[PDB]
Amino acid sequence: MEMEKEFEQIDKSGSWAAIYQDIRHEASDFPSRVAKLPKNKNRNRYRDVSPFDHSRIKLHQEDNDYINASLIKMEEAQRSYILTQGPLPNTVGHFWEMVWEQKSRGVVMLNRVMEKGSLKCAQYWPQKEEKEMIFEDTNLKLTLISEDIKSYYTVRQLELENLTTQETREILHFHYTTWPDFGVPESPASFLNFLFKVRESGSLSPEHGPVVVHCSAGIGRSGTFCLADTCLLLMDKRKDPSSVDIKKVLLEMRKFRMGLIQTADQLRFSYLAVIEGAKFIM
Ligand SMILES: N#Cc1ccc(CNC(=O)N2CCOCC2)cc1
Ligand SMILES: N#Cc1ccc(CNC(=O)N2CCOCC2)cc1
């Protein structure tokens, strides 16, 4: 079926939970043996969210190459994304090592450091120009260059220096600051505006490594971001945009990381975002 009218048909019939449970039943199951090794317990935020072995990102290290991060490669759309958990106190150096080694231009953050009164990820970037951060375990230096605070999101320019080689690179930090502590946003308008700002920066384009996107677990809000982006790109590429099947795209993405889209409300919000976004594109 088309999307907008399939949407109204699920609303009127109140069957979002049944649609979402079908997706969960059909989703791929692949091994994640490296994630579960005992030496990696303090590298995982949640025991039930792990990268598959076949698609995990490897650190360029011989001691321990593990990080909770996955490469999502969308062949027809010609987009790639790295989805990862919010960094932990003992993985902030690994996080920036990955950004460096994978040649990413941008980092997309969809959570606040504290939500619901609890810490959802480490403070992993510097908050003042004159107070830089040094990650001694991976030999990297990180400096805040500039910050632009808007009503729904903040964009930061960061300088990442490989201290072994003295090479430097400019990284863009796109921080969506207004996702509610509970539920999903009422309108997709600010989330779409944010997506378009990431796109306009070049961070999603083939001349760079894959964008790094995270929330707390790296599957819920993060899944919504890449699902909406890929669906809108396919609607632009194809002769028949009504042929784009958001459930099929989500199942394809779940071949590369488990659990993408965590609730039926997140599924409905993804439909809403693609529907409204397709009208603005034209
Ligand atoms: N990029 C991309 C991309 C990702 C997932 C899908 C899922 N759809 C799919 O398998 N089909 C079957 C054959 O053509 C119609 C849609 C398609 C494209
Ligand atoms: N290449 C690049 C690039 C650099 C920085 C940004 C973010 N903007 C920023 O730092 N400011 C400073 C305060 O007023 C103006 C905007 C985006 C792209």
Distance between the termini: 22 Å
- Report the order of strands and helices: HHEEEHEEEEEEEHEHHH
Number of strands: 11
Specify the biggest β-sheet: 9 strands, mixed
In CATH terms, the superfamily is: Protein tyrosine phosphatase superfamily
Sheet with most strands: strand arrangement: 1-2-3-11-4-10-9-8-7
> Into which percent range does the helicity of residues fall?
25-40%
Shape annotation: globular
Q: Give Rg in angstroms.
A: 19 Å
CATH class: Alpha Beta
Number of structural domains = 1
CATH topology: Protein-Tyrosine Phosphatase, Chain A
Strand portion, in percent?
15-25%
Membrane topology: Peripheral membrane protein
Active site: 215
Cross-link (N,N-(cysteine-1,S-diyl)serine (Cys-Ser)): 215-216
Keywords: Acetylation, Endoplasmic reticulum, Hydrolase, Membrane, Oxidation, Phosphoprotein, Protein phosphatase, S-nitrosylation
